[PDB]
Design a protein around this nucleic acid. Sequence first.
DNA 1: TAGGGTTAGGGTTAGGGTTAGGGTTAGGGTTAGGGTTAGGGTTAGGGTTAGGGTTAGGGTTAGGGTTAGGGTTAGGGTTAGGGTTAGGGTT
DNA 2: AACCCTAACCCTAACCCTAACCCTAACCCTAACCCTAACCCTAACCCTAACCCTAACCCTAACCCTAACCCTAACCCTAACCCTAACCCTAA
Lengths: 54, 110, 98, 99, 84, 87, 87, 100, 99, 68
Amino acid sequence: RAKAKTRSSRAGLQFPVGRVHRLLRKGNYSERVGAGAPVYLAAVLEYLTAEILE
Amino acid sequence: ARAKAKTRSSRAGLQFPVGRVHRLLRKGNYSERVGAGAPVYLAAVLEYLTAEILELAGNAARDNKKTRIIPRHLQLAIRNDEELNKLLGRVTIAQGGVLPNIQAVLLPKK
Amino acid sequence: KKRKRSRKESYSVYVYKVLKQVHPDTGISSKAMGIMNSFVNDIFERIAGEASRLAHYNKRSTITSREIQTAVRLLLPGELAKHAVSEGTKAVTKYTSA
Amino acid sequence: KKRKRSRKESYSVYVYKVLKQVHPDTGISSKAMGIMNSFVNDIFERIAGEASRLAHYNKRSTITSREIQTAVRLLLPGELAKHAVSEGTKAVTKYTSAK
Amino acid sequence: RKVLRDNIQGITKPAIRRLARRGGVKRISGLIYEETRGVLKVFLENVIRDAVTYTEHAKRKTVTAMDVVYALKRQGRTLYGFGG
Amino acid sequence: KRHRKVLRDNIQGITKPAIRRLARRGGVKRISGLIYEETRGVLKVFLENVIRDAVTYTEHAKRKTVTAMDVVYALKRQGRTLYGFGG
Amino acid sequence: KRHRKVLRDNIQGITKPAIRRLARRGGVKRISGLIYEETRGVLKVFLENVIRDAVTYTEHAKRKTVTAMDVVYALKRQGRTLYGFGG
Amino acid sequence: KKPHRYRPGTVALREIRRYQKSTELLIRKLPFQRLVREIAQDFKTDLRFQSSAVMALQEACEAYLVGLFEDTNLCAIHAKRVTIMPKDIQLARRIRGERA
Amino acid sequence: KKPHRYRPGTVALREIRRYQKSTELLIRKLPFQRLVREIAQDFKTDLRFQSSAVMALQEACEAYLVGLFEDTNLCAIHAKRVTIMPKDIQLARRIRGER
Amino acid sequence: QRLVREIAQDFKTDLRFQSSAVMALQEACEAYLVGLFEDTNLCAIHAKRVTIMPKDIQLARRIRGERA
DNA sequence: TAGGGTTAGGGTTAGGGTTAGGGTTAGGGTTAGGGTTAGGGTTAGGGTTAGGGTTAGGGTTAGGGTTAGGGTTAGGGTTAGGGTTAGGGTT
DNA sequence: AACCCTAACCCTAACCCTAACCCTAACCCTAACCCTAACCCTAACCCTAACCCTAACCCTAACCCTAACCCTAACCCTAACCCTAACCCTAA
């Protein structure tokens, strides 16, 4: 709680990297999410939303 | 201490297991809590479907007169009944041939 | 041998008992066991599978008996549904008594 | 009366910030936010559904990056999975290398 | 509300041609109009029956839009838009 | 050191008799001449697609052998469930 | 023995420095990053086109060896005219 | 009267163009709020439809019919005809995997 | 001299009836073993195929092909023709949706 | 030596390349490539840029007439 | 790596099935006037919900025993080869 | 009716076998809890129904021009024997 830096900003991705972790965990997809997976899956959604929106 | 130690499949009178089916629902990650009543409904619903395929399969083998069910009989039973041809309509049974049908125009009329 | 093989599980013993009840004098070849054992393991992923989603939409967190009766009225056809929703409740009724 | 207000959650702020990098000057009408917020929720239920089957077939219990990457190689087609496996690899490399 | 024949006669002959002209057809035979009232009645029976089964699970007596977006998704024709 | 031929079977073995045996099971009565080159073009875009997904699963386990459970797992995704060849 | 044959890694055999030494003779000062894949596309079409005409002359003479007076007789038709490495 | 009586085939190639460049819905709303409610009375009595689920059934039963019609047209141009006929709609469904 | 030449197209009706009543595979195993080996080289080299993997691929591939030819036939009988042709195969693939 | 050998497999197999044939192919292929770069450079200096890029190579090939 | 038997691979030939052309007639197309119904509004009242504390029974869960299911194995019961006889017509 | 194919066996002889037999491993009874699907006013909104209108849209004739169909030949091309003898099986 010393200072607040968004987990999206540290990896420089616009799409949320905190919300995708809760939705992967609370949908019962698997027992232990891991921490290299929320960040990879918030970048394969952002590239696709930047192909249809351009 | 314990006493009778009677089995769950025996209590409900269903041949298919009601012990293995509960473990698989719990560790497949379908949902966090599985109610005890639910495995018993699944074992019964699966049993009726196996009895329909095996009973219909046997009749077709009797007509061929061989005394063992084999893959070709199962295709002929599954692909004839209307309801079982709309659940298993995409599945391809291995070593199963095709049902015999020839269109009239190809067939020499005269 | 000294391998200590993990081994596998099969619903093959159970299928043989059912074959005996419906017809008491026929038998099944091993290739036929393979097609049948797969079906019992493919109608356990469609029927259980629709139950998982039906729990989340509602917000409820358990897969109880009603949720496996709204997944047999949707993933099974027409008259193999009325004769299977009815067959299942009878076994649940007996279990509750004993 | 007071409060008693549920909070609907939608990815709509984040689709009005990728329209402000690719094309400054244009704006999205309300229906297009609909037909977009229902796209992000459809390619997140096809990459968390081929990564919860790959974990179980191989008898393992965690979805690490390799698993969320096997799905992109299978579900997305050509000239779309190629321009996506790389985009993720640069984005995770920054997370570990730079703190 | 009703139980008459105006249900399938509501898809009138002009609007069973304009739907077609959005597809490319240039001449339409007389009996297409009867067969294409039959095919729409079967599709609606299958989409409506599955919406009712989900509605009963929650005990509600109103068939909301999300239930139709979940009936169509199962049969292979996803809809995007009129729902979430 | 090397089989002199490196053709890896160029869509071969589907000889006129094999395509005139599969078609006859189908119901075809008078197969036309040009079909043989085309039916060696449709088999080709299918054997590749089951294969690309099949290798993709094996590289995930890091093993170097394509076992039949990998082909049954790939065939389910495209749409046809083979029952029992692998189980 | 030599139990291996030439795979298709060759097209990436041209290295990243070699395309930066055939472009510094050309006057280029700040080569951009994406050029390296494109320059392996322009060379790839050219090497096939001199080659197909080269094999077509050799098969006319029913030999099995592509000698340089065949490359020089193919390169004249396409457009260039190498003078020197040939007669 | 020397007018502009258009010859058969020039008021149908101007119609295909106007209707293929629009986004509106062809079926009238009130007659499709009664087909939906006479196919529901049989399944359960007293079901009250919402006002956005009688427009998500219109936009999925007017985008499957404009789907059969393109497949009927490819079939009726394979027998050298330009007029869709009722023996074409039946072929399209069989191959697609719908009624058989 | 007995030519006994059955008129054109009557040997084949006997062929159709006998072929539809048996399940043996109709493409030879040794040639097919190689077509898969060639189409696997591009995806990776050093891939070793177990015996069952070639067998499954033969049962699926025969089954897709047997089907395309029952739908091509249905299209041919529509135009009043009685023989399959190259053009008919392409209407079946556009309608089925494979494209 | 290898790129030429791989490209030759498709046209025929059992083709044996004399030493001079792979030398000539090196002194023609370098010359086509050295040239495209001088024309790509002329195009780049036109737009006010000082660096070659992927788009510039395509204008040089359409104008020279090779791609069609 | 033998080796051996049969499957594919070449020829001819005659029939039959596309295919192009040439008439014939109902059937969609194209305008033109009558007779609405399907859209909009406004009220209003009932008909179904959205939270919110509150039990109590149904789960989970972590200990024991112990039962039931999963591998291995001779010898018999089909079950196909394997030849005759049958039997269908079939050019 | 040229003279071609269809239908009894019957020896033949490996793979489904019942045990049968351990025995390994997974269920079950027996004790703990917690937590949630039941419960309830309410107050809120939104679906249903009713009323009015009116003007674009359907409906029902007439007239006549194409396009679907049925012949007509005919002529190319796909069918059905026949020596191979090459290659795929079959062990091993």
